Design a protein around this ligand. Structure first.
Ligand SMILES: O=Nc1c(NC[C@H](O)[C@H](O)[C@H](O)CO)[nH]c(=O)[nH]c1=O
Ligand SMILES: O=Nc1c(NC[C@H](O)[C@H](O)[C@H](O)CO)[nH]c(=O)[nH]c1=O
Ligand SMILES: O=Nc1c(NC[C@H](O)[C@H](O)[C@H](O)CO)[nH]c(=O)[nH]c1=O
Ligand SMILES: O=Nc1c(NC[C@H](O)[C@H](O)[C@H](O)CO)[nH]c(=O)[nH]c1=O
Ligand SMILES: O=Nc1c(NC[C@H](O)[C@H](O)[C@H](O)CO)[nH]c(=O)[nH]c1=O
Ligand SMILES: O=Nc1c(NC[C@H](O)[C@H](O)[C@H](O)CO)[nH]c(=O)[nH]c1=O
Ligand SMILES: O=Nc1c(NC[C@H](O)[C@H](O)[C@H](O)CO)[nH]c(=O)[nH]c1=O
Lengths: 155, 155, 155, 155, 155, 155, 155
């Protein structure tokens, strides 16, 4: 019993990267803006890199890279894939999810899965600062905590 | 806040490869033609390699190879698997998707998932230059952006 | 058989103007932001003029003017008229459409009809960077192509 | 990116004309009174000309004239055609709309389409200062903005 | 009673231009190919100019231009606008139609309205060389006849 | 644009291996016989190794091995898992699919997924030389093409 | 435009007080524990006073007092009133709400309304650290922000 929890207060010193898919920009832009804001709100400053990728599928390798560059402590990946029609949804969703996972694992760097996978657009709108909160921001906050966790727990 | 976005304008200098499955040729051919056209339309010239594989399943390794050959900056994989009957659809779809993912990750080279996974043929027709746009073309464009992103962001 | 197509690559040298209606701002703002972004994304730079008009009806004359000023090569008109209730929808929609048409014809300058005419707000949201893409951006891109077409084909 | 927007504050110096159809006077009178009031409310003073025409159909030429007289900077046309029975509604509605459009285009002078085209009387009542606001006033305001836009943007 | 009919046999000597919208390319390409083929099939040779415009809306001015260039005897405009969802369909369809009309009238040069306006994609597929024939080809043939008519009837 | 396609004609010189699961032998036997036949039909001769494994699950490692033995150019895996009752179907199906995938990737050797995943026995019967063709044969043909592709494209 | 926002980072220096109603302890306890934790989590330290009152009704005066004591910068009030049966729910709910409001206003000290007013117990459970987050924690965080806001904005 020794609660090794991350610290949300010791931000500023860290370096983060946001990776966002342009798809469903209407939401993602917001999502991102949210994450961004949260960072600053949490005193962090090293002017976080935001990498734009066209689609959620992309998140995987992109994070992969950024992670392996050892330049950041945590990368948060944002995207939104609304269940529009076909299983294509699934396809992407899986790849997206899987990718981010693999990235984090392989890089040994926390990669935050801040991608919406709701059915209809509306639900999404809510996760992007609606009555459902803002995944973007949450993700950022998480990025912080994780990073911090890593340099406090380390082992 | 330093928007590291790819460049669609600085094409020409790059080397790409398209990998297409012959299955559902009626659509794939189109799909490919689209990607191809887009490349040229975007001033790129190194006469892109188009690799034909019989089925979407194949995409995985094929890309895998091309990717590891270090010869291309981005490989776009095209295919179309229409929900014809059985879970076979799923089987393929997953493998297809997973493969392309793995390829991109392992190769560290962007592999574009330009494969249709609609239910009926008609929906597909639409993604192949119908009122739903043209995934082929979109994929190409994406290939570009990703490649470019990699040599601008790099780290 | 001599494919006289426009060029999306030779942007920068051209001068464009966006005309947007404030009505349904929630969408139009986005729409516009999209077109704008696309311009820059396509290396164009002469800091495009954005003209705000209260309603889509206005587009007509406004474009008319800008067009006749011979200052721009293509003007893109953005607006969104959602089928809220009465035939008023039609009224506007027609006038809007007709206006933009007339403008283009009379001015001999491509005036892009980038105005949404969906029924419900939601559909619109989708055309403004949702799973339906972004008409704004599309329109911009088109503006480019058309302008370019005109100085390559000319006759 | 140079937001060329009109100015609602620099009114007074301008000259406007309202053209109203006597038909459905119960509403139009109001409508007009609204536009009028708004003008004064917006410090404008050159005692705006209000031209009465029996029916909305008339708006066309009447505006046409006023516009070509070069005396006004913007003419706002008011009328209300409630879907009472037959396609006559359409007939008028179209002509009305079309007319105002043509006027504006031909005259190069902003002609505001401040004519209601609701189905039932009640809906109209609402657009004439009901819970739906007041088209008349809106129209006036718009007239202002358009005029102003023209002498600030001009080209 | 003096049947002034055009001649489909005296082609070759004439100069034509095809204008096609990229939208719904899947069909338009075909449509065009059809028109093209027909021309050659009808011994015509001056290697017809094919002008690509992104959307049917564009047809108007584009034709307008080509027509006024006095270089061609007849311009055939191809496009296809499938009733996908909203009245947007109408908007476009009208503008498209109207444009081509205006062009022909203003230019005094026959502009063939070879644009499909079916509801579903499938119907279109049929007009593009299906059991419904090929509008593209038909349009070409018509272009010929009209041109010829003009130089035989003239007055 | 340089179509790097495999060759079905240059077979004979290559070495292949078929791996078949005994489960649902009634179909698999056929399936295999089909693949086999096709090979010979395509002039190949090095008397292809056929490896029997009890169940489709097994395919994975088995192929894995054969692949890594570097002895063959392509291994085709055959099996059939009919949706008899429980998710067990899925379990197997996934493992089967995944296995073959992994094999191909890890070995860098094309491993053909020639395993049926239909619901009822009958559908299968059809894929095994019924009105649905013969997956076995198709798979063989594919094995060929892939192998060939690898030594023609290589890089 | 000068965004006067509170600071979540500059906590520690402040003094807060939590007031919780014992009713529905099963939830409130949690609720409180949450708020508490958050405080610490946000580096605050002056060992926050937690005042227990039997029912939500009490919150009013209790806060009233604490607020007027000028000892704390923000008091967060926690409670939960589940719509068990009668309008009694309302009665309490109103008084509770109203009280906290009045307190905040009269004291000029931010009093956070961290009281659940869901219908069934279950919904509550969710707000108390379930998939609905934790109102308690949120309230604390807010307390912080408000306090901070007051000493940064002040006027
Ligand atoms: O398609 N739907 C979506 C999408 N595109 C798929 C993918 O990300 C990619 O761009 C190309 O498929 C191949 O690389 N991307 C999203 O972020 N959300 C979606 O809902
Ligand atoms: O079967 N349907 C499809 C398909 N074939 C499956 C697979 O790609 C492969 O060729 C062999 O199964 C063994 O590897 N490939 C597609 O691209 N789309 C389909 O809709
Ligand atoms: O009224 N609805 C709409 C609207 N106003 C009508 C018109 O554009 C104009 O502003 C004045 O009518 C004078 O003509 N403008 C829109 O862009 N969308 C609508 O949905
Ligand atoms: O008829 N109904 C209407 C009407 N009259 C039609 C028209 O303007 C004209 O007076 C004569 O048709 C011939 O010029 N005018 C309206 O403003 N609203 C109506 O509801
Ligand atoms: O939107 N739907 C369609 C479309 N786009 C509209 C237009 O052609 C144009 O490109 C811009 O609107 C403004 O210039 N064009 C079509 O050929 N079919 C459609 O079904
Ligand atoms: O159970 N049904 C099936 C099956 N058995 C499962 C598996 O292949 C394996 O033999 C053992 O599970 C673990 O090695 N194998 C098939 O080829 N088809 C089936 O339809
Ligand atoms: O009674 N129900 C509730 C309650 N007690 C009522 C009230 O707070 C008070 O204690 C006395 O009524 C009068 O002072 N307090 C709650 O947090 N939830 C309830 O659902």
């Amino acid at each position: 019993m020794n609660e090794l929890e991350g610290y949300v207060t010791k931000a500023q010193s860290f370096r983060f990267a946001i990776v966002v898919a342009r798809f469903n920009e209407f939401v993602t832009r917001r999502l991102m803006e949210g994450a961004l804001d949260t960072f600053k709100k949490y005193s962090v400053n090293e002017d976080i890199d935001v990498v734009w990728v066209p689609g959620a599928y992309e998140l995987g390798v992109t994070a992969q890279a950024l992670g392996k560059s050892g330049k950041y402590h945590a990368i948060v990946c944002l995207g939104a894939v609304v269940k529009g029609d076909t299983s294509h949804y699934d396809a992407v969703v899986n790849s997206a999810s899987s990718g981010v996972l693999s990235a984090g694992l392989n890089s040994g760097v926390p990669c935050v899965f801040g991608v919406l996978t709701c059915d209809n657009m509306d639900q999404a709108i809510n996760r992007a600062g609606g009555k459902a909160g803002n995944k973007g921001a949450e993700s950022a906050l998480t990025a912080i905590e994780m990073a911090s966790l890593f340099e406090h727990h380390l082992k």
